[PDB]
Design a binder for this molecule. Structure first.
Ligand code: CLA
Ligand code: CLA
Ligand code: CLA
Ligand code: CLA
Ligand code: CLA
Ligand code: CLA
Ligand code: CLA
Ligand SMILES: CC(=O)O[C@H]1CC(C)(C)C(=C=C/C(C)=C/C=C/C(C)=C/C=C/C=C(C)/C=C/C=C(C)/C=C/[C@@]23O[C@]2(C)C[C@@H](O)CC3(C)C)[C@](C)(O)C1
Ligand code: KC1
Ligand code: KC1
Ligand SMILES: CC1=C(C#C/C(C)=C/C=C/C(C)=C/C=C/C=C(C)/C=C/C=C(C)/C=C/[C@@]23O[C@]2(C)C[C@@H](O)CC3(C)C)C(C)(C)C[C@H](O)C1
Lengths: 160, 162, 194, 159
C-alpha cells in the first residue's frame, strides 16, 4: 500500500496500528475518502478560524432582523452559540447539499473525493498526482492544526 | 449453540441454568437479539453515567424556556425528575423511532442485531474481523449490563451518582 | 351416543375437535354451531389476555403509585377518574394502533379470518417460542394461556364487583363490622311490591 | 445393593435391616425421598445460618402491611410473621418446582434429575463424586435442621 498517494518524503507508510489487518483495499478506499473529506473540512476550518484574526470580521450584519453583526460575534468556539440558529441550519444545509448532490458510495468518483471542483487542477497526470498528494498533506496538517486551535480556544479564554 | 458468537475464552458455553440447551433455535435467536439490544442500551447508559463525571455536564441549557442549564441536573436516578417531562418524552420518542423504523421479527435482518445503523464502519469481504467486532460488542454489552445494574445500585444505596 | 366430556348430560359439541381447549368440549348453549370457531377462539384469547393484564393492573395499581401528579386511588375503580386526559388519549391511541395493525385492517367478524392462514390469537408476539418445542408441549403452553385467561376473566369480574359491594379497596376484604353487603338501592318490579 | 450411599465411611449402613428384601424400586423411591429431603434440609440450614452472619438483608416485605425484611425474626418464630400472601407465594414456588417435571418411577425426576445441573460433572467420572457429595451433605443437614428445630422449640430463641 505504499504507492497509493500519501507516503510523502517525511517518514514512509505511517500506520503504527492500521491497515496491517488484511489490507482490504476497499477499507483503505473508505478511509481515504474520509481522510480527503476531513482534510478539506479542516482546511476550511483552519482558514476560517485564522482569517477573522488576519483580516477583520466581514463588513455586514449576518442577521439584520436580529441586529447581529459579523463584528459582534466572537471568533472561534464561542461563535457556536452566537451565530443565529437559522444561520447554523443554513450552513448545515449547504453541507448536506455538498454531501448528497453527488453520490459518495463505493466505486464512484465521490468515493475518492472526485466531485468536479476542477479549479485547482492540470492535465499532466504526474502534476495531478503531485497536487492530490499536496491536498492530502495540507489536509492532514489542517486536521492537526484545527484540533490544536480548538483546544487552544477551549483551554484558554479565546482564540489564540 | 456452542459455535455462535458469545462463547469465548474465560468461560465456554455458559449455561448454569437450563436456558437453551433444548434446541429451540428461534428462542435462541430471540434471546440473542434481546442480549444484543440490552448490551447496546446498557453500554450507552454506562457512558451516560461515566461521562458526566469524567468530563462534566454539557455546556448548554436543555430547556431555554425553563433554564435548566444542563449542569444543574444531577447524574443518575435523580435526573428522572429534573429533566423536563417533554425532554424525557423526546428521548423515549427517539428510542421508539429506533425500535419501529427497523422491523425486528423472525428471519429478517433486524432480528440478529443489524438495525441498519452502519456506523462503526466495517467492510465486506473481510469476515473474522467483522466477527471479532461483533463478539467484542457482545462481551462489552454483557460487562456493561452488569456494570450499569451495579451503578444503579451504587447510586440508590449511596444516595447519589457514585 | 356421543356426549360432551365436561357436561355428560348434553351432546358432544362439534367444531371443538381440533383446538387447544377442545378436549373438555364445554359448549352447552352451542355458539360453536352458530359462529365461526376462529372468531370465538380469537375473542376468548383476547378477553383472557386483556383480563390478565387487567388483573395485574387492578392488583398492582394501588401499589406502583401512578403518573407524577395523579393519585392512584386504593380502589382501582376510581383510577379512571384520577387518570389524566392525556394519559387516556395515549392509552386509546396505543390500543387502537396495536389492535388495528395486528390484523392489517381486517379487524371485523366478517373479514378477520377470511384471508387464509390467520391463526386464531396468533398476533406474532413471541410466536417463535411455539415454533420450536414439540406439538404436545406447544399445545400445553397454549392451554396454560387459555386457562389463565379464563381464570383472570372471572377474577377481574370478581374484583370489580367486590369493589362495588364493599365500596372500597380490593384487598381489605370484608371490613370490620361487615354483617353482609348493604341491600341494593334503586327500584325494581319487586321494590314497588310486585 | 451397595451403591451411591455405600461410599460412607461406615459403609452399607442398614440398621433395622430394611432394603434387604430385594426392594429395588423401594430403594429408588427412598433415593428420591433422601435426595429431596437432603436438598430441602440444606436449603433450610443455609437459610437459618445466613440470617445471623450477615443478618437480615435490608429491604421491605409487605407493601400494605408495613412488614420489612428486618421485622420478620428467624427460626420457628418467623412462621407466623410472613403474611398470608408471602407464604402463599413460597408454597406456590414449592408446588411449581415439584410439578414442573414428572417424579413418577422410572423418570429422570425419579432420581433427582430435574435439569438444575449448575454444579454438574464434565462427564469424567466426577458425576458420582458430585452425587455422593450432595447426598452426604443432605443427610448431615437433615439431622442438623432437626436439631436446630428442637433448639428453637425448647430454648425459644433462634439459637
Ligand atoms: C480523519 C482522519 C484520518 C483518516 C481517516 C486517515 C486515513 C489514512 N491515512 Mg492519515 N493522517 C491523518 C488523518 C487521517 N488519515 C492526520 C491528521 C495525519 C497527520 C498526522 C495523517 C498522516 C498520515 C500519513 C503520514 C500517512 C497517512 C496514511 C493514511 C492511509 C492509510 C493509513 C490508515 O489506514 O489510517 C486509517 C485512519 C486512521 C487510523 C485514523 C484514526 C484516528 C485515530 C483513531 C484518532 C486520533 C485522535 C487524535 C490523535 C486526538 C484527537 C483529540 C482527542 C483527545 C479527542 C489512510 C487512507 C498513509 C497513506 O497515505 O497510505 C497510503 C500515510 O503514509 N496518514
Ligand atoms: C469549516 C468551515 C467554516 C465554518 C464552519 C465557518 C463558520 C463561521 N464563519 Mg467562517 N470562514 C471560513 C470557513 C468556515 N467558517 C473560511 C474558509 C474563511 C476564509 C474566507 C472564513 C472567513 C470568515 C470571516 C471573515 C468571518 C467568518 C465568520 C464565521 C461565523 C459566522 C458565519 C459566517 O459568516 O461564515 C462565513 C463563511 C464563509 C464566507 C466561508 C464560505 C461562523 C462561525 C464570521 C464571524 O463569526 O466572525 C468571527 C466572519 O466575520 N468566517
Ligand atoms: C437480557 C439479558 C441476557 C440475555 C437474554 C442473554 C442471552 C444469551 N446469553 Mg448472555 N449474558 C448476559 C445477559 C444476557 N444474555 C450478561 C449480563 C452476561 C454477563 C454475566 C452474560 C454472559 C454470557 C455468557 C458468558 C454466555 C452467554 C450466552 C448467552 C446465550 C445462551 C442462551 C442463554 O442462556 O440466554 C438466556 C438468557 C437469560 C436466562 C437471561 C435471564 C436473566 C435472569 C433470569 C435475570 C436475573 C439476572 C441477574 C442475576 C439479575 C441482576 C439484576 C437484579 C439484581 C435485579 C443467549 C443468547 C452464551 C452464549 O454466547 O451462547 C452462544 C455464553 O456462553 N451470556
Ligand atoms: C367472553 C369470553 C369467552 C369467550 C369468547 C370464549 C370462547 C370459547 N370458549 Mg370459553 N371460557 C371462558 C370465556 C370465554 N370463552 C371462561 C371465563 C371460562 C371459564 C369457565 C371458559 C371455559 C371454557 C371451556 C371449559 C371450554 C370453552 C370453550 C370455548 C369455545 C367454544 C365455546 C363457545 O361456543 O363459545 C363461547 C361463547 C361465549 C362465551 C360468548 C358469551 C356467551 C354469554 C353471553 C356469556 C354470558 C353468560 C354468563 C353466565 C355471564 C370458544 C372458543 C370450549 C372449547 O374450548 O375449546 C375449543 C370448552 O370446552 N370455554
Ligand atoms: C384509537 C385510535 C386509532 C389509531 C391510532 C389507529 C391506527 C391505525 N388504523 Mg385504525 N381504527 C380505529 C382507531 C384507531 N386506528 C377505530 C376506532 C376503528 C374502527 C372504526 C379503526 C378501524 C380501522 C380499519 C378498518 C383499518 C385501520 C387501519 C389503521 C392503520 C392505518 C392508519 C393510516 O395509515 O392512516 C393514516 C392517516 C389517516 C390520517 C387519516 C385517517 C382518517 C382521519 C380520521 C381523517 C393505523 C395503524 C388500517 C390498517 O390498515 O392496516 C394497517 C385499516 O384498514 N383502522
Ligand atoms: C343492555 C340493556 C340492559 C341493561 C344494561 C340492563 C340492566 C339492568 N336491568 Mg334491565 N331490562 C332491559 C335491558 C337491560 N337491563 C330490557 C330490554 C328490559 C325489558 C324491556 C329490561 C327490564 C328490566 C326490569 C323489569 C328490571 C331490570 C333491572 C335491571 C338491573 C338489574 C339486573 C336485572 O334485573 O336484569 C334485568 C333482566 C333482564 C334484562 C332480562 C329481561 C328478559 C340492571 C341494572 C331490574 C332492576 O332495576 O333491579 C334493581 C328490574 O327490576 N330491567
Ligand atoms: C427451606 C428454605 C427456606 C425457607 C422456608 C425460608 C423462609 C424465610 N426466610 Mg430464608 N433463606 C433461605 C431458605 C429459606 N428461607 C436460604 C437458602 C437463604 C440463604 C440465601 C436464606 C436467607 C434469608 C435471609 C437473609 C432472610 C431470610 C428470611 C426469611 C423469612 C422471611 C421470608 C423471606 O424474606 O424469605 C427470604 C422466611 C421465614 C428473612 C428473615 O426473616 O430473617 C431471618 C431474612 O432477612 N432468609
Ligand atoms: C414448649 C417447648 O419447648 O416444646 C418444644 C418441643 C419441640 C419438639 C422442641 C418443638 C419443636 C420444634 C420442632 C419444629 C420439632 C419438629 C419435629 C418434627 C418435624 C417431627 C417430624 C417427624 C416426622 C417423621 C418422624 C416422619 C417419619 C416418616 C416415617 C417414619 C416413614 C416411615 C415408613 O414407614 C413408612 C411410612 C413406609 C415404610 O414401608 C417405610 C418407612 C420409611 C419405614 C416445639 C413443638 O416447638 C416446642
Ligand atoms: C440566495 C439564497 C439565500 C438567501 C436569500 C439568504 C438570505 C438570508 N440568509 Mg442566508 N445563506 C445562503 C443562501 C441565502 N441566504 C447560503 C447558500 C448560505 C451558506 C450556507 C447562507 C448562510 C447564511 C447564514 C450563516 C445566515 C444566513 C442568514 C440569512 C438571512 C437573515 C435573515 C434575517 O435575520 O433578517 C437572510 C435574509 C442569517 C440568518 O440568521 O437567517 C435567519 C445567518 O445567520 N444565511
Ligand atoms: C431537529 C429536531 C429537534 C428540535 C428542533 C428540537 C428542539 C428542542 N428540543 Mg429536542 N430533541 C430532538 C429533536 C429536536 N429537538 C432529538 C432527536 C432528541 C433526541 C432524543 C432531542 C432531545 C431533547 C431533549 C432531551 C430535550 C429537548 C428539548 C428541546 C427543546 C426545548 C424547549 C424548551 O424548553 O424551550 C427544543 C426547542 C428539551 C426540552 O426542554 O423540552 C421541552 C429537552 O429536555 N430535546
Ligand atoms: C406472551 C408474551 C409475553 C408475555 C406475557 C405476559 C404479560 C404474560 C402475563 C400473564 C399474566 C399477567 C397472567 C395473569 C393472571 C391473573 C390471574 C390468573 C388472576 C387471578 C385472580 C384470581 C384467581 C382471583 C382473585 C381474587 O380477586 C378475586 C376474584 C376476589 C378477591 O376478593 C379475592 C382474590 C384477590 C383472591 C412475553 C414473555 C412478555 C413476551 C412474549 O414474546 C409474548
Amino acid at each position: 500500500f505504499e504507492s497509493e498517494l500519501g507516503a510523502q518524503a517525511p517518514l514512509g507508510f505511517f500506520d503504527p496500528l492500521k491497515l496491517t489487518g488484511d489490507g482490504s483495499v476497499e477499507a483503505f478506499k473508505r478511509r481515504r475518502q474520509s481522510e480527503i473529506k476531513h482534510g478539506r473540512i479542516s482546511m476550511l476550518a483552519a482558514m476560517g478560524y485564522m482569517t477573522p484574526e488576519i483580516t477583520g470580521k466581514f463588513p455586514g450584519y449576518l442577521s439584520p432582523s436580529l441586529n447581529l453583526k459579523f463584528a459582534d460575534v466572537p471568533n472561534g468556539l464561542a461563535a457556536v452559540s452566537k451565530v443565529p440558529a437559522a444561520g447554523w441550519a443554513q450552513i448545515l444545509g449547504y453541507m448536506a447539499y455538498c454531501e448528497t448532490s453527488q453520490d459518495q458510495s463505493a466505486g464512484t468518483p465521490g468515493a475518492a473525493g472526485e466531485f468536479g471542483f476542477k479549479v485547482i487542477t492540470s492535465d499532466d497526470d504526474e502534476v495531478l498526482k503531485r497536487k492530490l498528494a499536496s491536498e492530502l498533506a495540507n489536509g492532514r496538517l489542517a486536521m492537526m492544526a484545527i484540533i490544536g486551535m480548538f483546544y487552544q480556544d477551549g483551554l484558554t479564554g479565546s482564540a489564540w | 449453540f456452542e459455535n455462535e458468537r458469545g462463547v469465548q475464552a474465560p468461560v465456554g458455553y455458559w449455561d448454569p441454568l437450563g436456558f437453551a440447551r433444548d434446541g429451540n433455535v428461534a428462542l435462541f435467536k430471540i434471546r440473542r437479539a434481546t442480549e444484543i439490544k440490552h448490551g447496546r442500551i446498557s453500554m450507552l447508559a454506562a457512558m451516560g453515567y461515566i461521562t458526566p463525571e469524567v468530563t462534566g455536564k454539557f455546556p448548554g441549557y436543555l430547556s431555554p424556556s425553563m433554564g435548566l442549564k444542563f449542569a444543574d441536573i444531577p447524574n443518575g436516578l435523580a435526573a428522572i425528575s429534573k429533566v423536563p417531562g417533554y425532554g424525557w418524552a423526546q428521548i423515549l420518542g427517539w428510542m421508539a423511532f429506533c425500535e419501529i423504523s427497523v422491523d425486528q421479527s423472525p428471519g429478517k435482518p433486524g432480528a440478529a442485531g443489524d438495525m441498519g445503523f452502519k456506523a462503526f464502519k466495517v467492510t465486506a469481504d473481510a469476515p473474522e474481523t467483522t466477527e471479532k467486532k461483533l463478539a467484542s460488542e457482545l462481551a462489552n454489552g454483557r460487562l456493561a449490563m452488569m456494570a450499569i445494574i451495579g451503578m444503579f445500585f451504587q447510586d440508590g444505596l449511596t444516595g447519589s451518582a457514585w | 351416543k356421543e356426549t360432551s366430556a365436561s357436561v355428560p348430560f348434553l351432546p358432544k359439541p362439534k367444531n371443538l375437535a381440533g383446538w387447544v381447549g377442545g378436549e373438555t368440549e364445554f359448549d352447552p348453549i352451542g355458539f360453536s354451531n352458530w359462529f365461526d370457531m376462529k372468531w370465538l377462539r380469537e375473542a376468548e384469547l383476547k378477553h383472557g389476555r386483556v383480563c390478565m393484564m387487567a388483573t395485574v393492573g387492578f392488583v398492582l395499581q394501588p401499589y406502583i403509585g401512578a403518573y407524577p401528579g395523579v393519585e392512584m386511588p386504593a380502589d382501582s375503580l376510581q383510577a379512571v377518574y384520577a387518570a389524566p386526559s392525556e394519559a387516556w388519549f395515549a392509552f386509546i391511541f396505543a390500543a387502537g394502533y396495536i389492535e388495528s395493525s395486528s390484523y392489517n385492517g381486517k379487524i371485523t367478524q366478517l373479514n378477520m379470518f377470511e384471508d387464509s392462514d390467520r391463526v386464531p390469537g396468533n398476533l406474532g408476539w413471541g410466536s417463535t417460542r411455539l415454533e420450536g418445542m414439540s406439538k404436545e408441549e406447544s399445545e400445553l403452553m397454549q392451554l396454560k394461556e387459555l386457562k389463565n385467561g379464563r381464570l383472570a376473566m372471572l377474577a377481574f369480574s370478581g374484583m370489580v364487583h367486590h369493589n362495588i359491594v364493599v365500596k372500597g379497596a380490593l384487598f381489605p376484604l370484608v371490613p370490620d363490622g361487615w354483617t353482609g353487603p348493604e341491600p341494593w338501592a334503586v327500584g325494581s318490579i319487586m321494590n314497588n311490591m310486585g
